[PDB]
Amino acid sequence: MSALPELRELIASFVSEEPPEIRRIRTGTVPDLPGSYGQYFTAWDFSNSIVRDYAMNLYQLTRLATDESVSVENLLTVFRTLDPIYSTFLGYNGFPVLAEYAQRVGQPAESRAELLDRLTTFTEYVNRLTAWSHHYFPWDLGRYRYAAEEVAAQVDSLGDPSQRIPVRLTWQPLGVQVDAEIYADLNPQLATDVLKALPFTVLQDHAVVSGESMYAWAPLVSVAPTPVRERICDAPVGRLRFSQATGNKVIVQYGPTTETLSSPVLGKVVDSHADRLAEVGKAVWESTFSSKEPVWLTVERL
Amino acid sequence: SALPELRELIASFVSEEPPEIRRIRTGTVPDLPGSYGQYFTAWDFSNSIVRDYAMNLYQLTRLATDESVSVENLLTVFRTLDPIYSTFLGYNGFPVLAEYAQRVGQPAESRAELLDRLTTFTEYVNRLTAWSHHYFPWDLGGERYRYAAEEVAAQAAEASVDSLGDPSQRIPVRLTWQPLGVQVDAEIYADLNPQLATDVLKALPFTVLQDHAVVSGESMYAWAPLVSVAPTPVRERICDAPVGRLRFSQATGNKVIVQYGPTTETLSSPVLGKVVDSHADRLAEVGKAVWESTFSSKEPVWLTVERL
Ligand SMILES: O=C(O)CC[C@]1(C(=O)O)N[C@H](C(=O)O)Cc2c1[nH]c1ccccc21
Numbered sequence A: 001m002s003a004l005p006e007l008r009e010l011i012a013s014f015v016s017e018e019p020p021e022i023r024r025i026r027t028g029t030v031p032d033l034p035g036s037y038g039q040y041f042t043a044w045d046f047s048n049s050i051v052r053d054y055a056m057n058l059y060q061l062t063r064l065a066t067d068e069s070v071s072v073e074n075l076l077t078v079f080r081t082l083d084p085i086y087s088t089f090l091g092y093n094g095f096p097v098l099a100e101y102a103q104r105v106g107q108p109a110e111s112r113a114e115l116l117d118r119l120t121t122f123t124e125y126v127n128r129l130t131a132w133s134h135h136y137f138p139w140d141l142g143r144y145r146y147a148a149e150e151v152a153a154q155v156d157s158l159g160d161p162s163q164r165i166p167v168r169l170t171w172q173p174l175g176v177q178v179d180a181e182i183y184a185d186l187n188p189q190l191a192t193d194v195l196k197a198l199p200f201t202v203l204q205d206h207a208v209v210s211g212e213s214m215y216a217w218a219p220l221v222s223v224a225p226t227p228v229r230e231r232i233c234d235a236p237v238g239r240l241r242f243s244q245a246t247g248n249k250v251i252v253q254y255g256p257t258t259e260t261l262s263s264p265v266l267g268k269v270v271d272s273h274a275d276r277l278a279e280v281g282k283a284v285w286e287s288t289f290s291s292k293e294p295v296w297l298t299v300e301r302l
Numbered sequence B: 001s002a003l004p005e006l007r008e009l010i011a012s013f014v015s016e017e018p019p020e021i022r023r024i025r026t027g028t029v030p031d032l033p034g035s036y037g038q039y040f041t042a043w044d045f046s047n048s049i050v051r052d053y054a055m056n057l058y059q060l061t062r063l064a065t066d067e068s069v070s071v072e073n074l075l076t077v078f079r080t081l082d083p084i085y086s087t088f089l090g091y092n093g094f095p096v097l098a099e100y101a102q103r104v105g106q107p108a109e110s111r112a113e114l115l116d117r118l119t120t121f122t123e124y125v126n127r128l129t130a131w132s133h134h135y136f137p138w139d140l141g142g143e144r145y146r147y148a149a150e151e152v153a154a155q156a157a158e159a160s161v162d163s164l165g166d167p168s169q170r171i172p173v174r175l176t177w178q179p180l181g182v183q184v185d186a187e188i189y190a191d192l193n194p195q196l197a198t199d200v201l202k203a204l205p206f207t208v209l210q211d212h213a214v215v216s217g218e219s220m221y222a223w224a225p226l227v228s229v230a231p232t233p234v235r236e237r238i239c240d241a242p243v244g245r246l247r248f249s250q251a252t253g254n255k256v257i258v259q260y261g262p263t264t265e266t267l268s269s270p271v272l273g274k275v276v277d278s279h280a281d282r283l284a285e286v287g288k289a290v291w292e293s294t295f296s297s298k299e300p301v302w303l304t305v306e307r308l
């Protein structure tokens, strides 16, 4: 079964609908009135920030539940030490249900597998809350721009053809359809958990720091190894990336990116459909920055 | 010390701005992080992640005090949590932080070796977190997003540790704010949270930068030069806290916190002491200048806490 069933009913609802907490924060209707001197953007910066970093903490704690080197109780000690300062603040800043369930994950787990299910459901709960928070934060406010002269100055063969799994990526209301190959031999365990989620329809958002890249919070939590990773900057156009640590997102790189980090490789959009990604990216950039007009991503198998 | 070079950098950065913070707020970070030629999105990530990496670093420092967890187990949780935090900060304006983050997790022989690394790194990140909080642009929301004044009055309308203990054990101190030129005297409650008060008093005297609370309300915190794993048996709800209250939040940056007005936060924080009632009326002026200092002015206000 599932250790926290009420979360699962919420997780499925939140891939479709805006979470109530994301609205009350973006509408400034949080009960305790967070935010100094009659404003709520300072509370908004924290509410968006913590929930992303809290989610990343939860995943690395969930990763250690797979580890038998660290005992079950010592892991609870590590959780009960790290969780309260994150959960108590977020409950004050329009995440009360999230605060309540963090205490249940800390409650003594008879089996390590139970604790793994508590962390797995909760990490998915926070990461969907994080997904909408990345969308509705007012990134358009940043007056602070690079000089035009500064911006102006700036694995597919490896593998087996039989393991290439055909998938389609469809973005609406734009209507752009592209097909892609999922490499199931490079990261076999990772791809198996992403394939199981297909078909999934999730919201599409743009990278605020990474460059010309888009991601979407897919409905899975993968503790699977990542043997084949690729530098984000070294990636080709049409690259399908899956970043488990940043929220189990499905990442598409439709242009040159600045970030130096190494991210796991899921697959690549066919080169003939690579030209279509550039039109979607601009719309996804505007939706995250300015419009807040939802662009939904549908990934399906062929 | 395990990292003596960093202790020179911690002492240097108390007075002066770190080089990493300046290049982020001026948009001179090397790889030009951001999307479509703007460095505010990277700024929002740099400031926030270093804040949450610092809080994670302290709880790892507090994890070393517990002997139920082995060092190999403790190193493993640092080897699992840190990489996603260290590597990005190295990309987003904190390259040296990633250098010492790798050195903290190297196989340690003793608990004191790991605790000294975590204690030094945490304070180094807590000063970097301090300067990122002062210069960050919080005025952007005041122009666009504001609570209504009438709904504020209603939220206050709908809403003793000072009595506890021996008044003889309290230790007087002095907080001096420059360039405002305002002095108040305060008593530190050594009975309630003794090990904490000892750990703070040993740092006296110190002169540090003073900033405001962006979310908590009418409160101002100053990053003091210590990392305290001391027990906190007496804590108080920040919304219930009185005016002139001195608090020390070991988890949110080891800061000296002065409440000079209404605060809405429900979290409980250890009680350091209280400004004497005769000198409480001087706090209203300082916080108004401290608000503008962090909210708008970005003009340094300094705090010198000394023993009397
Ligand atoms: O893989 C890529 O190119 C994107 C990498 C990334 C992601 O969420 O996956 N981008 C996000 C952004 O700045 O917009 C933030 C972010 C990413 N890793 C991170 C690792 C640590 C902290 C933050 C991030």
Ligand SMILES: O=C(O)CC[C@]1(C(=O)O)N[C@H](C(=O)O)Cc2c1[nH]c1ccccc21
Pocket (backbone or CB within 6 Å): A050, A085, A086, A089, B212, B213, B214, B215, B216, B219, B221, B238, B247, B249, B252, B255, B257, B265, B267, B269
């Ligand atoms: O203790 C106080 O007076 C206020 C409490 C607090 C602090 O400890 O600094 N305020 C800061 C703010 O919101 O601006 C940030 C902050 C505090 N707790 C926190 C817990 C989790 C995350 C952030 C914070």
